[PDB]
Design a protein around this ligand. Sequence first.
Ligand SMILES: NC(=O)c1ccc[n+]([C@@H]2O[C@H](COP(=O)([O-])OP(=O)(O)OC[C@H]3O[C@@H](n4cnc5c(N)ncnc54)[C@H](OP(=O)(O)O)[C@@H]3O)[C@@H](O)[C@H]2O)c1
Length: 177
Amino acid sequence: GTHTEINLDNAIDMIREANSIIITPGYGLCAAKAQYPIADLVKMLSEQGKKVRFGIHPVAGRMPGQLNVLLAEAGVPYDIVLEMDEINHDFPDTDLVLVIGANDTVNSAAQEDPNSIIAGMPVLEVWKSKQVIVMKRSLGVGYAAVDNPIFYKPNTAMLLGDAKKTCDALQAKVRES
Ligand SMILES: NC(=O)c1ccc[n+]([C@@H]2O[C@H](COP(=O)([O-])OP(=O)(O)OC[C@H]3O[C@@H](n4cnc5c(N)ncnc54)[C@H](OP(=O)(O)O)[C@@H]3O)[C@@H](O)[C@H]2O)c1
């Protein structure tokens, strides 16, 4: 089949091996209320000395600034939350990107296909990192109703499930130490 599926233990080993992690959150994160386990995951991984930051697209979510507000409300410190144009240049130097409920905001067809409906629209360049894990329930579309090439790239693994079920489980496995 055209994409790669991984399990939770594969994801934990990828996190463990990464020094630098960027989370790119989208609508799926807050649809699932996954902000709460994620804020604890990030605190634990930061305590293990990893560089853990968020890269948030200005149009992520369904309301302006929605991911920024909900992550702040959940306790994520403002100093590790960056704007797209502040963080995009770092993706080639990033060991692991966690795409959590984002799709349109990380869709490479905006740069790779000049005849795409989203051609020319700015995106987060997550496919330039060493390893991408996409957390969503299916191989299906987001708001713009288009396919996303990053799901079939060789450095992408799909971690399929509801975002809060997955992140609760990853929080538990990291808490194991
Ligand atoms: N921010 C705004 O104010 C605003 C306003 C108007 C339009 N928009 C548009 O909406 C989009 C925002 O980009 P985005 O990357 O945040 O999101 P998105 O590209 O619309 O994709 C969110 C996708 O999240 C997954 N998802 C939904 N519920 C989930 C759950 N419970 N667990 C796991 N995954 C879940 C769905 O895939 P599955 O069904 O496979 O899980 C979903 O594809 C852009 O096209 C933007 O232009 C934003």
